[PDB]
């Protein structure tokens, strides 16, 4: 039985209603739950969903050199596959493998409706509206590593902001936007942004274009015999239109706005 | 010296003005010429651009089973890398390797301006306006393999249309749209469509959403020592913003409409 690391992140992996009465995999639902079932069926594996203990995507500590999050679970042999909105990045590709993308996305801006912001440049040239991002993820790294003036300016502000503008979870970031009367904006992936825009109370909005262009991949540890089967499975699911059906199912068919 | 297979396709690879006075690689310009230069610089190779002799992207003949086009050049060892708008597909992944995507795209519809068509459904529901696609590529295979009702209907029409609606080159398809007074539409990748929309005589238009979501990758033959270096170089260029800069350079900075 293959251990699948994943993360509680709507609408990828969520608790069922009355999840406490279900056992194992049956506790959970969502895009990545369905994707896990689809891949497992295609490659012929039994699997067990294990929610990442630390609740993180995956970053490397500069001192200890230790990987945390889902990336860590793969690197240290605690999971055999990651099926999650895990961004394909250079630093991760050096330690784990990724399938070709199952979803395409870019970093984006979430505002409380009515906030006078439509671009990164708009955020960077002002201080009346605070902004932040998820901790320990690819978005934070994007800003830390950027050599583009506008993003450098945003990083310089965010890294020194007090109280901290980096959140433990996406939901925390969203909640912060919603309660801050337009005075906090959140930098997050277009996928999560567009999902939240269709959820009650319908008070948030994606503004401007995406900051970058990238993808999520299904990840495996180096040397895994699952690498090629997984890659081919993702491509088959893409070409068969199943990935499109799954996105429509979890984003738009269930839309509330 | 690494042999780089590529294809004459605007704005990826084009002849310089007065190409005839230049030698070797310096005869060419375009997005993929710049990409090859960037990749070679990162991985430390010398290279020679070789335009694919048959002028095809690459398909497997059902009878003889032989790969043609750029895919063929790699499979039979006539080239060491493909740097071109080559779509990452399942059937190709079975015979060659691809980097993670350097460009994201989907199939789209090109019309002559004023054509009463806004969607694939619009095309499938009528017979007055003919429509087709490129030979030996991923768009043709998309329609052949689709089980989506609308696309099945389009395939059934296109495969048996007289005169032929399939073209040998993208340029042929585009010329046919421009010359056919609204009575021909062309199915091609969003990237090519968007480029053409910004070129004189500014008489074409992309209509409707993309039919799928996929990527172009830099391709290498199985067992190539260049596989990993190429993959990391593409991700490095992505993360540094170079891919975005090159798209802007070749699509929009050079817009004519
Ligand atoms: N998908 C991101 C997490 C979300 C974010 O950083 O915006 C990652 O893999 O790290
Ligand atoms: N990029 C496609 C060719 C263009 C098309 O098929 O529309 C391929 O690699 O086959």
CA distance A16 to A13: 9
CA distances (Å), B184 to each of A3, A82, B181, in order?
52, 46, 8
Same domain, A91 and A148: no
* Residue B115 phi, psi (nearest 5): -60, 125
Location of structure tokens 């901290």: A164
Rg (CA), chain A: 18
The answer to whether the Cβ–Cβ distance between A236 and B212 falls below 8 Å is no
Contacts of B202 (CB under 8 A, 6+ apart): B256, B257
HSE, CB side, 13 Å, CA atoms: give it for residue A43.
Answer: 25
| Resolution, Å (one decimal) | 1.9
- The runs of H, that is alpha helices, within B161-224 are 170-179, 190-197
Same domain, A101 and A54: yes
The technique is X-ray
Same domain, A13 and A100: yes
Nearest by CB to A239, from B90, B217, B244: name it: B90
Cβ-in-10-Å burial (0-12, 13-18, 19+) of A151 comes to: buried
Same domain, B24 and B122: no
- The runs of H, that is alpha helices, within A111-198 are 120-124, 138-145, 149-160, 170-179, 190-197
Same domain, A31 and A81: yes
Enter the DSSP assignment of B20: G
Same domain, A93 and A54: yes
Domains of chain B: total:
2
Distance from CA of A127 to the nearest CA of B (A): 26
Contacts of B28 (CB under 8 A, 6+ apart): B13, B14, B15, B16, B19, B49
Q: Best substitution site from B138, B169, B212, B217 to test ligand 2's pocket, by max atoms within 8 Å of Cβ?
A: B138
CA distances (Å), B217 to each of A170, B35, B48, B98, B146, in order?
31, 11, 19, 5, 22
Q: Which domain holds residue A172?
A: 106-214
Same domain, A90 and A135: no
**Other C-beta atoms within 10 Å of B111: how many?**
25
The helix or strand, by DSSP H or E, that contains position B32, with its residue range, turns out to be helix B31-43
Q: Cα angle vertex A117, ends A116, A120, to 5°?
A: 165
The tokens for A166 are 């980096």
Asked if A226 contacts A81 with a C-beta cutoff of 8 angstroms, the reply is: yes
Same domain, B113 and B83: no
HSE, CB side, 13 Å, CA atoms: give it for residue B157.
Answer: 19
- Cβ(B193) to ligand 2 under 6 A? no
User: Which chain B residues have a beta carbon less than 8 Å from that of A100?
Assistant: 88, 93, 98, 100-101, 215, 217
* 3-state SS class at B253: coil
Residue in A175, A143, A178, A183 with CA at minimum distance from that of residue A159: A143
* 3-state SS class at A194: helix
The DSSP line for B71-95 is HHHHHTTS-SEE-SS-B--HHHHTT
Same domain, A148 and A187: yes
Residue in B245, B211, B42 with CA at minimum distance from that of residue B141: B211
Dihedral angle, C-alpha A190, A41, A232, A243, nearest 10 °: -30
The tokens for B1 are 């010296």
Same domain, B92 and B133: no
Same domain, B63 and B18: yes
User: Which chain A residues have a beta carbon less than 8 Å from that of B100?
Assistant: 88, 93, 98, 100-101, 215, 217
Q: Strands, E, within chain A: which ranges?
A: 2-6, 14-15, 28-29, 47-51, 81-82, 96-98, 103-105, 107-112, 130-134, 166-167, 184-189, 204-207, 214-216, 219-221
How many residues in chain A? 257
Buried b (16+ CB within 10 A) or exposed e, A183-218: ebbbbbbbbbbbbbbebeeeebbbbeebbbbbbbbb
Q: Annotated binding site of B, which residues?
A: 85, 87, 92, 138-139, 189
For chain A, how are helix, strand and coil distributed in percent, rounded to 5?
40, 20, 40
Location of structure tokens 């070409």: A239
Asked if A5 contacts A78 with a C-beta cutoff of 8 angstroms, the reply is: yes
Backbone torsion region of residue B167, taken as left when φ is above 0, otherwise alpha when ψ lies between -120 and 50, otherwise beta: beta
Same domain, A134 and A202: yes
Relative orientation angle of helices A149-160 and A138-145, to the nearest 10 degrees: 110
CA distance B88 to B218: 9
């Amino acid at each position: 039985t293959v251990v699948v690391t994943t993360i509680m992140e709507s609408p990828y992996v969520m608790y069922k209603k009355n999840h406490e009465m279900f056992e194992g995999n049956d506790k959970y639902e969502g895009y990545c739950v369905d994707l896990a079932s689809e891949i497992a069926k295609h490659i012929g594996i039994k699997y067990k969903i294990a929610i990442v203990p630390d609740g993180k995507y995956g970053a490397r500590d500069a001192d200890t050199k230790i990987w945390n999050g889902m990336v860590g679970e793969l690197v240290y042999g605690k999971a055999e596959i990651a099926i999650a909105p895990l961004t394909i990045t250079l630093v991760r590709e050096e330690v784990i493998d990724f399938s070709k993308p199952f979803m395409s996305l870019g970093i984006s801006i979430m505002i409380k409706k009515g906030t006078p912001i439509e671009s990164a440049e708009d955020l960077a040239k002002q201080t009346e509206i605070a902004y932040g991002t998820l901790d320990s993820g690819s978005t934070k790294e994007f800003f830390r590593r950027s050599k583009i003036a506008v993003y450098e300016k945003m990083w310089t502000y965010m890294r020194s902001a007090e109280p901290s503008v980096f959140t433990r979870t996406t939901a925390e970031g969203v909640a912060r936007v919603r309660k801050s009367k337009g005075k906090f904006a959140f930098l997050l992936e277009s996928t999560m942004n567009e999902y939240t825009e269709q959820r009650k109370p319908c008070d948030t909005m994606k503004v401007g274009g995406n900051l970058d262009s990238k993808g999520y991949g299904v990840a495996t540890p180096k040397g895994s015999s699952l690498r090629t089967p997984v890659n081919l499975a993702v491509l088959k699911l893409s070409e068969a239109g199943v990935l499109d059906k799954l996105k429509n199912k979890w984003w738009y068919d269930k839309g509330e706005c």
